[PDB]
Structure formats: C-alpha cells, structure tokens
Amino acid sequence: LWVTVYYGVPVWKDAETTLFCASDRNVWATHCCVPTDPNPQEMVLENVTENFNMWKNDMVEQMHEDVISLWDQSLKPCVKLTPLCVTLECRQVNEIKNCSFNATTELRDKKQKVYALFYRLDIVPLEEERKGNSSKYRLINCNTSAITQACPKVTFDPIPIHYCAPAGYAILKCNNKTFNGTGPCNNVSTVQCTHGIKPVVSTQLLLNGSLAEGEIIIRSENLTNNVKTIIVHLNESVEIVCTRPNNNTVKSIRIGPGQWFYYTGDIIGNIRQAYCNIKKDDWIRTLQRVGKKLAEHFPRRIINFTQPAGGDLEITTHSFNCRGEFFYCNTSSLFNSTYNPNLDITIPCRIKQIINMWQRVGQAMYAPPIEGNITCKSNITGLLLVRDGNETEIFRPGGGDMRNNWRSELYKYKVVEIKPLGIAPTRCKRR
C-alpha cells in the first residue's frame, strides 16, 4: 500500500571481483599466506535455485592469471642463463648427451670448461651430426629468449589453496552430485572460501583432483561441437606412479658474480628411460565406464579411445611435474580401446629441462636436476578428452589450455555481489 525501504535485504547479483587467496620455500605458501578459518561454515540456502555456468566463470580466469603470475614472479630474481647460450660440443654418453662448453666465470677475464649431461630434447644441432664423434650443438630456445633457471631453494609443489571472496561479496556452491556445467542448481549453499584446490599443472589426465560424488560426470560446453574440450570428472581415482630411475650426480658452477648454475654432472650406473606405472585393472574399468557414459551422451555410436594426433610434444603427451622434473609421457598405450554398446601398464616418458610453460613463446625456464632417482605417486582423478568429429566417435586425449584444469575444480563455485538495499510495499505511510 505504501513504499518502504529496507537495508540488509538478502538479494544478490552475478558479479566479478578479485578473490584473495588463503591457505592453512613454497611459492603457494608465500602467496596465499592469509590463514583459513578452522571449520569454515557452509550455510545451505533452502529453496534457492541458481543458474551456474562453469564456462565463462571469472574465477577460472582469475586463477589462471594468479597461477602464471606467481610462476613469473617466482622466476624473476633467479639466475638468467644468458652466458650458457654458447657452442656446446656433445658426443653421446659412454636420449642424453655429454656436452662440453666454455662457460663464463665470476671474473670477466676468465672462462671455465664444463662437461654437462643434457637431454637431446633440450638441444639443437648447430653443425652436421657425427654418431660417436663430438658434434657442435646449442641449447634449444636460446635464440627465442634467455632461459631463466628455476631456483633450487624455491619449490613449486602444489598445496591446497582457497579462493576467498572479499567483503561485500559471497560464493555460492552447488551441492548437486550430478549436475552438468551450464544450468540451474537447486541445492545451493553460501560460503566465504572454496575448498582446498591444488594448482596441479598437467595435460590429458587431471591429477590429485577432487572426485565426483556420484557417477563419472562428462561436462562439455557443446558436446555436439568437436572443437570444445570434454572434461571427465571421475568418481574413483586411478593410481599412477611416475619415476625417473637415473641416479644423477648434480654439480654446480659460478657463471657470474653470485650466479650459480646447476647441471647434471654425471649418471651413476645404468641409464634407463623414465616411466609411469598405472594400475591396469582400475584403468580398464575407468575407461569402460567412461565409454558407456559417452555412449549415453552419443547414442548409436561406437566409442573409440585412440592416441592423440601428431602435434608437438607438449600437446600430444601427458605432461606433468614431479619434484621439478618435467615428464612427458606417451599415453598411446592407455587410450587404445573401443566400447561397443551392443599387473601395471607401463608408459614410457621423456624428460625435459628447458620448459615453455603456459603455451608461451619467448619465456623459457631451466629446471635444474635433482641428485638421485625420483618417484611420485599421483592419483589420476579426471580426463581431458576431445572428440575428433561415421557411426563411430573418436575421442583423443586433449589439454594444453590450463583453463580447463582450473575449471575442473571451479565448476561448483559462483561469485555474487550482495545488494542489501531493497524496496517493498507495506500497510502504513511516513507521517
């Protein structure tokens, strides 16, 4: 009957804001240094229905920018390997090559001859090759840009990080155990911070993620579009154990006034290729279930899991990081199956030291070695597939765009600005 103004009204709008990181010499501990509340309260909003859309979610963009930002900042004060773009002379080890080069010393009027083992992937043949003989070579991606050494004292091990909303905003979490990305959700709950999200960098297979509560969920922006990436959230993990067996002996040298360069001085014992053992029975079960789900989404079609096409190494292999060692594994032996609706697997892996992260050109990183052999037990929790696009559907491993990885953990969350000012009718005037 009469207008009335209320303040403190529970009304919100979709909005974008800079969420601040908080977690309970790691870069993810220096950043995200804000502590998290013990037992953060989740308030369930009864009868509230909210439209979620995991794609076009600004939280994913913020996480992408924050992740690369920390990596770039963390590499800023480190040693630039500009003195090491010189002629190497490599002659095989009595995959890996025993290169030799004249590196600079702290004194400008001095040089030092250095013998270092470099992976063949990290080198470019400057001169014609020569089998056992020593040929001239150069470090890869030198001409593109200077190579910055990742600091040995700074570790990039992922830790669970929570993205908290600033004051005046809130986060809405969908609590539906089977909910495709873009659509309404009935079971919404308000929160101040996300769950513990580990920013694990990988391709093809999502590692150390969060398992789906219900079945295996297939989320894709446009399934009928063959350009979009399908994200498969698994409801059960699969164990994969990665390992570099080589027993490295790591040396160091001074390439400047306080600039230390760490390289693989030697390998003790036999030289063997790195590999990943994934549990066979669990993998076969997982692929069968994913095939049935894809058949449900793609009726009257045979579901073929094949190897990726012949692109670059960074995009045709399961790439990941284990204690700073950068593995690229050939998962062709895994995606080698077919579902018709009508004892470990060993995966060879190459290892690189000169890395071009985030699909960028002109910013390379040198990942120094680690003495000894290396092992990492990671849980595969999700897959990144791409439909080739016949009466048969071909799904290949995908990835490369790290956005999807962040989205794989941020599909639940939405950011909303609170509009406390509201107007409603009442039964009385001002007077």
Partner: protein
C-alpha cells in the same frame, strides 16, 4: 551468514534481515601488499567496497531514511508496479523473486522517493 533466509518468504526474511542486519554488521600480508601488483588490486577492491557502501548510504540519506534499516515513506504503492496485495509479497514470495519482479520499476520508484523528500524538505523550511 550474509544470505540467511534467502529465498525464504520476505515476511520471514524481514523478521530475520533486520535482526541479522544488526547482527551481521557486514561492510562498514607484506608479500601481498608490497610485491607485484597484489597490493594495488587489494586497494582497488577495498576502495570499490567503500564506494559502494557510500552509494547505498547516500541513497538512504537522500530519501530521508538516514540511519535506519527499515524506513516507511510517503510514496504510495502504484499497482502498475505490482498488483499483489500482500498475498505473495509477504506470503509465498521471496526477496530474490521480488527483486526480479520489480527490476524494471526500481529507478522509477527511486525518483518518487527522491521527489517526496524534496517536498518534505521544502515543508520543513516553510513550517518553521
């Protein structure tokens, strides 16, 4: 705690929003404040929050509702905005749904509120 009783019967929510509003008291790190562009972004977020709070407070003050979480006004309700005589509004309807209902009329209502206070202010200086 921000959105307690959301989607929850504006009558009940208003029984809570005034109680919670006073209870909530919502609104008003050297690495993250000196290294990189983190600090500038925190400052931008905080300044934007202050600006939005001051915008809401200014709108309350212009309408004569300064310092009040609930304030009746001299603007009578026009049925052209909504034709529901408290049956759904304080009954089956929620604050979010109600906001969706009068999303198109809101600016118009503000003008009337604004206009009303003008008259009162003029009257305030004419009766004295």
């Amino acid at each position: 705690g921000f959105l307690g009783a959301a989607g929850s019967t504006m009558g009940a929510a208003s029984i809570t929003l005034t109680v919670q509003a006073r209870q909530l008291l919502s609104g008003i790190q050297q690495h993250l404040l000196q290294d990189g562009h983190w600090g500038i972004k925190q400052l931008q977020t905080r300044v934007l929050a202050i600006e939005h709070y001051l915008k809401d407070q200014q709108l309350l003050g212009i309408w004569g509702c300064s310092g009040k979480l609930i304030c009746c006004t001299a603007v009578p309700w026009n049925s052209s905005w909504s034709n529901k005589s408290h049956d759904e509004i304080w009954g089956n309807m929620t604050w979010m749904q109600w906001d969706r209902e009068i999303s198109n009329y809101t600016n118009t209502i503000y003008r009337l509120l604004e206009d009303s206070q003008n008259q009162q202010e003029q009257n305030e200086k004419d009766l004295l």
